Amino acid sequence: ELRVGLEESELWLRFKELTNEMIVTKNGRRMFPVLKVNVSGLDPNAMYSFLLDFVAADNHRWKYVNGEWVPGGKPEPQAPSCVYIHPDSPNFGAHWMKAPVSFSKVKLTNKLNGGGQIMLNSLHKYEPRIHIVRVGGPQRMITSHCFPETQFIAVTAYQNEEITALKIKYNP
């Protein structure tokens, strides 16, 4: 059976209890923390690609109002975000299982851009999700997995200073 776990969930949970925020820019901003996934149960000799997208967790716009995030009252249809392909793709299962798969190069933006960058809507809440695609073989297959621990609100600048502090405290 294919198993997908979140690496460093302890740390993500610290961000989630504060309501996590991720910066978007016109040119694209990398995430902190980085999504790192532990995978086991792949066929070591089969070929896979690792894909990442961001599900809009609700249809609302969020606002930081007097020290707390609150959702608006005018929902709109949202999804889907584009998909980011992990740069190691395509690769053998053994490659993906030898170390946590780390999405350290995805860039979050708020502008339609030349490619690579993933456009999100500022002030919307998102749930990262991966797709593990078995490629090249006879039987294509997709296994998907979301990571509720890694939910965040996309922002152009940090609103909650407790998030700002945690981001610095645990980055290098």
Query: What was the structure determination method?
Result: X-ray
Do the beta carbons of residue 107 and residue 28 sit within 8 Å?
yes
Rounded to whole angstroms, the Cα distance separating 18 from 107 reads 23
Cβ neighbours of residue 168 closer than 8 Å, sequence gap 6 or more: none
CATH no. for 3-166: 2.60.40.820
Q: Could you write out the three-class secondary structure of 122-139?
A: CCCEEEEEEEEEEECCCC
The residues that bridge with 83 in the sheet, in sequence order, are none
Do the beta carbons of residue 149 and residue 15 sit within 8 Å?
no
Tokens describing residue 97: 């299982």
